[PDB]
Write a protein that binds this ligand. Structure first.
Ligand code: HEM
Ligand code: HEM
Lengths: 472, 470
């Protein structure tokens, strides 16, 4: 058993299998982390996921962890977790299965010219999918629409199989739901065969993502066409493993985007001021880009710049994620060393984890007054432009909004994710009349079973009503 | 990391913090163990609760694990688990904190002469609590109120200084017990109690009420608690709080299985008309010719140990209810490296490995119990209407076929009292009340497997029933 040595942080004994564990018994990961802050101050160590995990919780010390330090390994833990959860051999080039740098592949094909073609394809796919009042769970609606749109955008479409396209997508959606469901457990080292349904779901998704089946598809993303090419040319992976590297991309493209979309839609519709400000901005932008909206007419086309210069939508989305983001931001100690923070100096052993839990900052009332209130204009300045000035103890923060991470540990899809959510909100507002069945119903609590994993979904779905607009 | 070596069982890769973990993600502990049987056969090793746990799932090998084995330590894990969940220093006499043997203390105060007084007191306490409109209520919630209070008063006595506020003391303890017990599957697994703020305060408020200074104010305390106070004071160097926590252990053990056991026994009996009829007829016979009349505004019913014991219909109804709800992990620790010889073969076990049975697997085995998921109220009755003790597996007569109280030295010291209290409760319900379910044709609730490993599993949801004084 491990004992706190000299200069080491306070050590909380107790095994925490994973952050969302024991939710059914009344566990609350956020409040648990807060309670340790009060007990131990801003740096403490938990036995978390079979690791020793040093939480750094002072917003003003974040920059000391997010810089490219000499004793930080920002990939080891991620690579190992991906292997476990998806079931493939290591993709760390250091283990000799590939010479590919997957991060460069993501950056290369998720930004620049590639991003433009993704964005354009998503807009086209969203309109094909989205074109009386219908009542439905809002999460379930966002799941259908966004899953299909994102799947077809990243993995292209099977045009030989047109009439069985809705069957294939519904199977995939269902399989994805069942696999993603158990993901918090998988990351933690719990065996997938404890989850027979999720295990079958996973392998069925992997099957559908074998190169043999992806070669039948057209308008495949540049990301997946390149990843196929480098699987083939730079790795000694077998055919199933290859399929699972594409499953890693399916999961990453989907697991945060779906709940982010829900929250952004829910929070807009729920708050009449947000809805009015969003509705006007979208009208103004479509009007003077000359884009007509109709169900049967020609599609809408928006420039990168027109999509990007939507500050109200950006603020709505940022505020939605400030409230729902629950990532564990992680790196591993390359060796024994001393970490120097504003809070003091702490000795860290080799292979210890150094973690941030930025939800603690996002909900900090010192940085964000009334932190639990959705303020649609929170990230707008006096000019109605995107606001970038936020403070802690009078000091201007470099890191204050982190739902995509930061540094080298940063979502390569982040610009695309924002584009796709903006596109969805644009189309929802343009195409439909929208009402909450319970306009006064409390906001669902976050479901903290996925704490650590990204954007948290609602604990319960909420019903809403939608109706195609008539344009006069 | 550990690998499977020569002669060791199949080693399952994967961390399992506790058996009821990840239920929210669709885990199912019973089916998980069955799936391992199928894949690996009757002996397999899981990384469970931070240990390497060898499961022995062939019923014909149970006898080789349950015998007083020279290679087994049947107390090490329990002592350590108790210390963690309740928050006290080791009670293992090897660790110098006490020289008391608590097993002997339990046996001495829960059986023999001591059992007579416990049984009498419970029957008195039950009657005081249970004594004309139809009242509708959740059946589990009802069994919880009544059995918790009856059992708390029987074990810990009554404060007669403050009769007018006793209902309030009991209600606070009841609520505090619920909150502490809710988190118990996590605690045994090593999850920290302070991760459950409400349960932690609840645990500590219960402990406060069971300090010797507060127990001293109480009267008609059980010989169990009196003797345990005595041996705390004379045989240990425990502090005042630790002394309270040793009494909290007993509160928990006396309550956590009895409450769900009672619910299942009542529910199963009301829901199955042939069971209700058989139980009603038997109870009346026994009261009649023990010369005991039943009235609300009358004198207490008194039954001997023999009269209570010779109730085979009630005994079968209780056994069959536990056959269907019992989910204990029966554990012992390997004192050293050794070879375990089973019907299945021979397996090398390491020092500090756990050897586990999960008897729910045998209780629900269709080879032993035809139609295992059906409650047959006469399943433990023979042709003669007396207790049936002959059950077979592959044509071999089983020594171990009904194990909800455990067996061997790892056996509930309170089992006789437990059956009496449930019999007494069922006798009084039949005697006092008209009873019916709101949905008599409604489905049986599923077991709640978040508590898998811990004893009798409660229903996942409560069910409503109506009652009325006759
Ligand atoms: C609101 C939507 C999204 C959010 C909040 C989000 C957030 C994140 C976060 C926090 C990480 C982990 C970074 C770290 O390790 O610290 C990540 C990684 C990643 N994200 Fe996103 N993401 C979103 C959508 C997307 C989309 C649409 C894609 C497009 C394919 C994507 C692709 C990826 C990939 C491939 C990684 C793995 C990075 C690596 O280890 O090389 N994400 N994302
Ligand atoms: C239906 C009701 C009950 C059931 C099914 C039950 C079952 C069990 C089981 C399975 C064990 C662990 C056996 C092992 O070590 O393998 C146990 C232990 C224990 N039981 Fe019960 N029990 C019940 C009610 C009671 C009652 C009413 C009491 C009253 C005091 C009680 C007192 C205890 C105690 C003190 C232990 C700890 C044993 C030790 O460490 O010496 N139980 N019980």
């Amino acid at each position: 058993s491990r004992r706190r040595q000299t200069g080491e942080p306070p050590l909380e004994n107790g095994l925490i299998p994973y952050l969302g564990c024991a939710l059914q018994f009344g566990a609350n990961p956020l409040e648990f982390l807060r309670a340790n802050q009060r007990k131990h101050g801003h740096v403490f160590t938990c036995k978390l996921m079979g690791k020793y995990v040093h939480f750094i919780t002072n917003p003003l010390s974040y920059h000391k962890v997010l810089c490219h330090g000499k004793y930080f390994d920002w990939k080891k833990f991620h690579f190992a977790t991906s292997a476990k959860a998806f079931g493939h051999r290591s993709i760390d080039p250091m283990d000799g299965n590939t010479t590919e740098n997957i991060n460069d592949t993501f950056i290369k094909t998720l930004q620049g010219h590639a991003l433009n073609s993704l964005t354009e394809s998503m807009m086209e796919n969203l309109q094909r999918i989205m074109r009386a009042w219908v009542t439905e769970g809002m999460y379930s609606f966002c799941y259908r629409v966004m899953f299909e749109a994102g799947y077809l955008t990243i993995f292209g479409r099977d045009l030989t199989r047109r009439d069985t396209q809705k069957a294939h997508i519904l199977n995939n959606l269902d399989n994805f739901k069942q696999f993603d469901k158990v993901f918090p457990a998988l990351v933690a080292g719990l065996p997938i065969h404890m989850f027979r349904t999720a295990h079958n779901a996973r392998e069925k998704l992997a099957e559908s993502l074998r190169h043999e089946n992806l070669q039948k598809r057209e308008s495949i993303s540049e990301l997946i066409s390149l990843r196929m090419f480098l699987n083939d040319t730079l790795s000694t992976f077998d055919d199933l493993e290859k399929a699972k590297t594409h499953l890693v991309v399916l999961w990453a493209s989907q697991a945060n985007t779906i709940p982010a979309t829900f929250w952004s839609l829910f929070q807009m519709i729920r708050n009449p001021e947000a809805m009015k400000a969003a509705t006007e901005e979208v009208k103004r932008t479509l009007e003077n880009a000359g884009q007509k909206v109709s169900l049967e007419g020609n599609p809408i086309c928006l420039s990168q710049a027109e999509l990007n210069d939507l500050p109200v939508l950006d603020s709505i989305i940022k505020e939605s994620l400030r409230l729902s983001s629950a990532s564990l931001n992680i790196r591993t100690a390359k060796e024994d060393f001393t970490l120097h923070l504003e809070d003091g100096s702490y000795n860290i052993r080799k292979d210890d984890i150094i973690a941030l839990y930025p939800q603690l900052m996002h909900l900090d009332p010192e940085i964000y007054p009334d932190p639990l209130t959705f303020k649609y204009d929170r990230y707008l300045d006096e000019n109605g432009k995107t606001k970038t000035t936020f403070y802690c103890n009078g000091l201007k923060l470099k890191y204050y909004y982190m739902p995509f991470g930061s540094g080298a540990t940063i979502c390569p899809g982040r610009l695309f994710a924002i584009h796709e959510i903006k596109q969805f909100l644009i189309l929802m507002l343009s195409y439909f009349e929208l009402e909450l069945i319970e306009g006064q119903a409390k906001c669902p609590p976050l479901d903290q079973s996925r704490a650590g994993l990204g954007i948290l979904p609602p604990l319960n779905d909420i019903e809403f009503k939608y109706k195609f607009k008539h344009h006069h």
